[PDB]
């Protein structure tokens, strides 16, 4: 059940920017410009996810401090899957990150827990790191099933026997995505504590304290500092605000003072 | 109707293998009587566009129904155009049956893509069980009726008939089977749209097309080209492009 003890600050912070279906050469140029000019908050792993057609472009222009990730991928390296990309391609492009299980993939494009778990297992085997997304819908939280949803989504990869060194868990309540309805620091902290409790029992105390757990869902330059006060929130997954200069303010808010 | 040959690389490719394909394609001379389009995986679209001779156009393997928005993992016609491309494959069997894209979603994608000013290779095809049950005509017509219902125009649409049972199995449709379906498709277009559209719309065949059968399939008058998967990854793809030469 939902643990109570707060974690110590023993994990490297993480701030990811998911551009979603946004971007063209000109706008990507603009983003890369403010990202490169930003201070190199070495205390924070910074990752951005451009749409597939702009992955190589972004990597060629970004400073070493900003890593590039794919927004999704499939479960085999090569094959007859029109419209899909694989970890092999991600590696070929010189990238080492991928976002899997994003709310939009699960609820707009119907990706199942099983599929997402298979993708995760394969991506990890390939040597790429994964930002594993989980989260409940408003009706589910109101029915008191926040824990049940997150448990199932996480158990899906535990059952596949994945290792956790290269996994960053992103808790993103569906109701907070692009709605401005940000979870309160308290609400987020309690879910993150529960997630660590889950990891402690399902895996090990070591994994629980080493695994980064970031919050996503209407994170803005104005609430980042406030949310970052919670020891169990190791960073954020940013959507809309990752397309603007405010993304830098969010990174600065998370970095060591 | 000018011959149309498309190469769908599907989820295949890295810089090295893409370079190999670009090499044999660039080595070939252009054929005035054949339009050639290849569809690289999304991460290599720009790379392929910069490396390929002007005679070969690049197409995206899929896209969504809005120009921009919160749809992680999706690309749009706006991006396709920004990349300098003018083609997209929609409704491919793998999207419909492996990733569950509905007839309605595909029709909406098609409407949006055409509105954006890009051309569409609209894919349709029945499964083995549907053909055995006598619904080849029904299934293919239903998939087409979906865009007819949306009121799309057809000047920028190439129809790709690819029976599911013939994809990557080596179980190629015979020339007679394909010709029969393409004739039905034109009848559908002549009735639902117009005689002009029925005669102008290019209908290409896909499903285990190889250098061994392309020449023979190409002799059927209602087949206006091919959509090639596995065979598009090797040099003999050029023999398919020149199927009517």
From Swiss-Prot, chain B:
CDD domains referenced in this protein's UniProt entry, alphabetically: TIM (cd00311)
Q: Where in the cell is it found?
A: Cytoplasm
Which residues act catalytically here? 92 (electrophile), 162 (proton acceptor)
Principal subcellular localization: cytoplasm
Gene3D superfamilies (UniProt xref): Aldolase class I (3.20.20.70)
A GO cellular component entry from the record = myofibril
Q: Which SUPFAM superfamilies match?
A: Triosephosphate isomerase (TIM) (SSF51351)
**EC number annotated for this UniProt entry:** 5.3.1.1, 4.2.3.3
Q: How does it assemble?
A: Homodimer.
**PANTHER family reported in the protein's UniProt record:** TRIOSEPHOSPHATE ISOMERASE
HAMAP family from the xrefs? TIM_B
Descriptive protein name? Triosephosphate isomerase
Species of the source? Caenorhabditis elegans
């Amino acid at each position: 059940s939902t643990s109570l003890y707060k974690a110590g600050l023993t994990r490297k912070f993480f701030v990811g920017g998911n551009w979603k279906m946004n971007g063209d050469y000109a706008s990507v140029d603009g983003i890369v410009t403010f990202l490169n000019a930003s201070a190199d908050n070495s205390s924070v792993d910074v990752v951005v996810a451009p749409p597939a057609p702009y992955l190589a472009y972004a990597k060629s222009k970004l400073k070493a401090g900003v890593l590039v990730a794919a927004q999704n991928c499939y479960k085999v390296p090569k094959g007859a899957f029109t419209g899909e990309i694989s970890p092999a391609m991600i590696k070929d492009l010189g990238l080492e990150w991928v976002i899997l299980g994003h709310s939009e993939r699960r609820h707009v494009f119907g990706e199942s827990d099983a599929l997402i778990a298979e993708k995760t297992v394969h991506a990890l085997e390939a040597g790429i790191k994964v930002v594993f997304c989980i989260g409940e819908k408003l009706e589910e939280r109101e029915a008191g099933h926040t824990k049940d949803v997150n448990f199932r989504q996480l158990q899906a990869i535990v059952d596949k026997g994945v290792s956790w060194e290269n996994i960053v868990i992103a808790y993103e309540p569906v109701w907070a995505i692009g709605t401005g309805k940000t979870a309160s620091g308290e609400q987020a902290q309690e879910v993150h504590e529960w997630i660590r409790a889950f990891l402690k029992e399902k895996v090990s105390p070591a994994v629980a304290d080493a695994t980064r757990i970031i919050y996503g869902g209407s994170v803005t330059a104005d609430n980042a500092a406030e949310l970052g006060k919670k020891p169990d929130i190791d960073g954020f997954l940013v959507g809309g605000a990752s397309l603007k200069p405010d993304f830098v303010k969010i990174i600065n808010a998370r970095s060591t003072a």
